[PDB]
Symmetry: D3
Subunit: 266 residues, 6 copies
Amino acid sequence: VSHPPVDYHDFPSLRCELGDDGVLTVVLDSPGLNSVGPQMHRDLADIWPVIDRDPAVRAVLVRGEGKAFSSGGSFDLIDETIGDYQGRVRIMREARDLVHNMINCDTPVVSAIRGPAVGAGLVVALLADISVAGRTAKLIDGHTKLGVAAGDHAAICWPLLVGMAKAKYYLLTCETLLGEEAERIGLVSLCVDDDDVLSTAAGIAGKLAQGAQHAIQWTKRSLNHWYRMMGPTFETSVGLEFLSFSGPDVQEGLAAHREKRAARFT
Amino acid sequence: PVSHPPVDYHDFPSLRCELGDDGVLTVVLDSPGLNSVGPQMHRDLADIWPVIDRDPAVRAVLVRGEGKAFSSGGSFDLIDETIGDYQGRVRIMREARDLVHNMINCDTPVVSAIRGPAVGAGLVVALLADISVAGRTAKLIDGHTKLGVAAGDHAAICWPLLVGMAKAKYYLLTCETLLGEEAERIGLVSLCVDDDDVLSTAAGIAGKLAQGAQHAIQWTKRSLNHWYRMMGPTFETSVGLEFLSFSGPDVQEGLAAHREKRAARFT
Amino acid sequence: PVSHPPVDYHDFPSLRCELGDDGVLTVVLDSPGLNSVGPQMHRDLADIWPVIDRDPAVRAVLVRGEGKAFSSGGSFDLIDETIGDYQGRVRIMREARDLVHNMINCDTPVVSAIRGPAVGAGLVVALLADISVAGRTAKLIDGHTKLGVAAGDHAAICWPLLVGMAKAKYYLLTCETLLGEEAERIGLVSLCVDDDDVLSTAAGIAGKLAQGAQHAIQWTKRSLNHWYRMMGPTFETSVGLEFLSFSGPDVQEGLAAHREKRAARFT
Amino acid sequence: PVSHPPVDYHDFPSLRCELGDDGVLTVVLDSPGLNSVGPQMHRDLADIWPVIDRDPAVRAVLVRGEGKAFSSGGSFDLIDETIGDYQGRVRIMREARDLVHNMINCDTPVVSAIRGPAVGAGLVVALLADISVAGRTAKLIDGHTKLGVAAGDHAAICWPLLVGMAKAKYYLLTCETLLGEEAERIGLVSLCVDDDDVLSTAAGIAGKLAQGAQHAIQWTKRSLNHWYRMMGPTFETSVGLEFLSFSGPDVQEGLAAHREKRAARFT
Amino acid sequence: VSHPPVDYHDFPSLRCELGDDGVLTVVLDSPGLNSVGPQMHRDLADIWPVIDRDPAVRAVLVRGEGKAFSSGGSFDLIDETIGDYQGRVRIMREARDLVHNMINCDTPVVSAIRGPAVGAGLVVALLADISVAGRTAKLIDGHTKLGVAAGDHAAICWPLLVGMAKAKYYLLTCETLLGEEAERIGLVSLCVDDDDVLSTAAGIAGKLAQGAQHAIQWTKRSLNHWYRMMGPTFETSVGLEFLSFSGPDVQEGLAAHREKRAARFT
Amino acid sequence: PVSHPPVDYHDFPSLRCELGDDGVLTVVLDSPGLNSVGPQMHRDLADIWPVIDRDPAVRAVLVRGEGKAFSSGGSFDLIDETIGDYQGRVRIMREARDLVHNMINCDTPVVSAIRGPAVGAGLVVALLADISVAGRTAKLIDGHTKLGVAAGDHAAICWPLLVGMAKAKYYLLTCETLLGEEAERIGLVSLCVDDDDVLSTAAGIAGKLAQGAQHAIQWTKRSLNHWYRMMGPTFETSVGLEFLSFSGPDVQEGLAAHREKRAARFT
């Protein structure tokens, strides 16, 4: 069966390096603590079906360049959502397809969370199969502090990671969750010293690419039915988030981020 | 102008309701016997939430018990009516069902301040709140199987999704006392602070929610609540099993053992 | 009267069954190779639960492994029949399905005493029991991906709802040894005690369960079990994937690596 | 005596409510433009059902439109407010969501008498009733995609479970007029009788329900409603998609085409 | 693997005949149009796990003796439910296990519905894989006319057979549904002339026992997940039914049946 | 701007794709043996839908079979690779899964023009389209149990929600031929027209869909598709069962009986 070839030239915002072991390193590298621009929002969403169709890739290691995973959506990305209907629908489709595609990717994914992981970056960090978080890594969903509903991933997984009591606490109040406490409540797989996050994650991803592929992938896919069965709930939250982008709270929350202040909502 | 009727809480006589300048509605359970839920307070707790959710003046809810106790659960008179009267049993059954379904279907944020014991119908309000603050020495006891009836007033809708099935099955089947400090570690409650700091911590949490982005907080809360809503039929199964067991002989012994300050000897 | 057939466990020769005065049925897994499950014990473990659930003399079940092991899982002859014979693979496949389904549909309370290693089909019984008591140093290993097959004997029905998805995927995909102390902390088991204290602790729990409110405990347990039942199709997906993978090349190497006490070189 | 507040329907000024000697509450939609749902009637239809369900005097509900039409759906002023104001769009969105969820969570039996057109918000009440009686020539039109917005006010919670996905997708995507006689054949409505017999047939059906076993009818109805309740998140997904599309350019054309007595030319 | 032997001496109220083709005929034969007594309520519930474990049985044909499938629960069965808690729990467990066991039986089942099928009999008639109903066969759930919630099967299947509008109509009002109309709305698989119901069903069951067994059974089991996923809803209705047996309506509805009159509920 | 890769369907050589001015992409299944699906067309049918859904020029999709047949299903060489090779069986198995999943997750409206027989993998495309137009005398046959394997290519995800469980089990277990006229009556297909009128009718529907409100039609379709998605695990269970049964003895006889144009004698 003839299948089309794979090259990642089509995802320009992401650096992708394939190793001898079969581990694909996907690096989020962009100004402002790896902030997700309009292009990287699409690239992150659409890359996963291509990786899963890649015969050379047996595992994926996702990380941010430098001392940060990703600081979330950029100001231009939030501006376009607020200002343009057709742009908002495009961005909304990408946010939906990011979660759906990571979940429907049978290939194992390991995340190396050092430093902040926010919004669209935290989606990739936590929906990875195995997540390695540093002790002082700041994990912030951040939506309600911005003034919109938390609809980019958390409604599909967080109760099944930490329990409803911890999920509601951090998602409604956006109190910062450090990496050491995140492992304790069950949000991430492992917590190591900050200097050991990438080495620990790299080692995990290496052994997965050298293991039994059908065993690892089919076990992962079966477990992913748990998230898949919460699809309608997630898409309910997605729609609620993008409805709220047309509201008055976000314009205050967006101005609050641009002025480095707390949002005073009314 | 779409005309909507005004709201006043005189229809809930067993509950003291205080609206603060911040928009937080404080709901206080105050009744004899460590805030025991009598027949009237069972209906009031069940039916107040749809009214609160439609209140333009209310932005957040802080639920607590008066003094050094949240609520000791249903009073002996409430249990006697369930056992003795079919029409009374059906009314209380609807109130137990609607308590859970109305708290979940209330988009307004709810914060609970659990100091002291939280039992049965009282533990329902304490744990179904969005953010729950428990004191270190707060006793959290579902208590149903020790009473002799099925645990069907809330635990089957949430406890597995709070602590995991292994801990859920352990505490619900054995009714071992779960203290507040241990409750937070396994994930049953949101926070654990010193007993003297429970009310101040919860009030501050409820304040910041009433001062936040209303639609953002409420729609995020509603989306998360679908996880409970999808376990609805499972929960209503536990409700019926509970009220079927109230006609059995075991509860008569468990209730008698409670009134007699002894352990229950079931046969 | 309604005539119901009498019950004696002679129909399950691989399992030792002891009925106590407390009402606890002790089910002992005892076989060569750290209580390895041969072809006969694979069926008995699957089919014993409907009969126990219909037993009037049984009020609770205590499962344990004989000696210093709970169970090492399916034996090499069981795996050999799985790889080589279609009718044998279908028979074993039906039993793996019915083991999980029948334990979940057993209303009788089940307590597991996990001292020593519990692997695969043995880990299914240990973790699907209602209350699980694990020793501090007890090795809990699903073991499928290290063997080279999909994890389809129980874990896809419960592990996410026991430890959360992040810990579930880590331990199930990598097969890192999970000790009992860490298993209790993350919520995979109900309790963790010293290894020498596992059996007395479990026996005490099963005793108090058999002397409690039967209908309350069994119906509370049954409602909680709807959480697993609703994931039935997910579990049966993993069952089919596991037995599809037994026909693959990976398991032949993983089996040979286990037989030579070395690490597997998968290609 | 558990004290519960009294019920009077003066809080629903757009709806005429008549309580008969049999216990049937007749709810009449009467408004200009073939009983078009204005801003006030949109809230009233949504919020009346929890009040009816708590009414001891009400044993059954008969919903109908005045004259030879059920309801033509939302008025042009209601659609203009949705498009033009965020706070107005949010209020109407909550009312659309709560209309569906309150009808389903109302245990009291509801019977609909569909003579003439039933459109949009009006078709919601007509089809979510327990037993629906449609005239032969009654036009049943969801109408959303022809208007230019997603079909998110009820059809995603029930239509597949009424007619099957192939017919559900056909009529909802194309908005072809579905007459009452054809609606009954595919299973969208309960009965089809002559147009002149719709009101007499429905009143008799509602009468026999109010004279039947109250808890039997209501608990049977509630159990069946879990089928809808379990599709809750799917329905709320359609609600949000509908109200997101109200900010798009297509609806402006569909609304303009409706006001101009022409076909919509979308680009 | 040694498995215990199978003989149906343990189900005394049911006549079971195994044919050369592999079809097991299970006949409901009892006084009063095959009324379900205390024993037959248990036998119907507990027989299915044994049939499914039977190597000799490849298909099942269920029918009533004479010109009736089954008239439902007997007066003594209803009396015991109303009067005794321990008896009510036993009967309730059987009603639950009847539905669950028929659904969890991989072996194909064909029902021959000629004449009335009520309550516990209609449960067996409609939960069969393929149902053959006569033109004039009366199909009546009958619970709300008796004064109890319809909790013996209908809440697990009826919406997925006829749609919610027809389900609510017949279950809430108990208007008689004849066999010809039942096929039209989709409640039964086939409708033939009354004299052809058993011959048509026998022929269907014969060909199923002579077909591909793993293909037929696994297709049936996968399709049965649809019912299995409505388990909690069904058990909600089961509990509601047996709670209502302690109410005042059933005592009137029971007296109404014993006096051959319509129940005047208050 | 956000740069997105260009789209041309040269990557799917077994499928003819024609783009019209109306915005309809016509996808034609054309191959020997009544449009039999060989190994290449099995992958193309699976993987084409994500690309179509991302195509800016495509507003609707019309699928049809060339000549007097929609599609006869998987070819004998495809079945031969399934029976004989593990890596080939896994590849074909992944494609069968992704065919259903990708059609359901394709927001673009799809209309099928079913003239003549549609069997197995071909029947998947015909019935999973949004609106299906079937000719009166078109033979619709799932065909799996007559072949000797489990029906795991689509029917377990939709047929109960298309025709009801009683008709679903009858046609899927016995493989009795279902003609288009009876298929429309029971709700398996959206429409039934004369055989010579199938293509013009489908083309007209797909045309009017491509000129309608895109976001309204696609989002209405996507919400309705959650009904199927929620049955995903059930569908994937049947997929695994089908490919487990391909290793059994029944299919070898059923395949030989088809090759000799005779009835299969299963043992």
